[PDB]
Design a protein around this ligand. Sequence first.
Ligand code: CL
Ligand code: NA
Ligand code: ZN
Ligand code: ZN
Ligand code: ZN
Length: 123
Amino acid sequence: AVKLSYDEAYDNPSSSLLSVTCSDGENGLYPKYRTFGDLPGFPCIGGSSDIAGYNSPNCGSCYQLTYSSAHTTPKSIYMVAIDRSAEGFTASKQAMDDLTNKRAEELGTVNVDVRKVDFSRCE
Ligand SMILES: [Cl-]
Ligand code: NA
Ligand SMILES: [Zn+2]
Ligand SMILES: [Zn+2]
Ligand SMILES: [Zn+2]
């Protein structure tokens, strides 16, 4: 497993793709997507340590993140990675609340299973 955290920066649909690591360049997401809210499956977007820096080939990849709660059955979300995180993943608060049944703030950071999946799964 890997760590999943959240950051409410990813909940603002109006933020520019120029504000994250996966800005422009061959692998960047601007100008195809101008703002966060243009991303497929917004607000299920965020950062990953698989984004090594500018122009990473992992920019725009779709990750299935699965949380197995102590108190309920498994749930997955599908996150588009657009930004570097220094370790593991950092999603929107809405995405982490979706994953954990509204416990993002309470938990802060959870362990998840991760698989890179087809981009269609984030659509
Ligand atoms: Cl990973
Ligand atoms: Na709060
Ligand atoms: Zn990875
Ligand atoms: Zn570590
Ligand atoms: Zn495909």
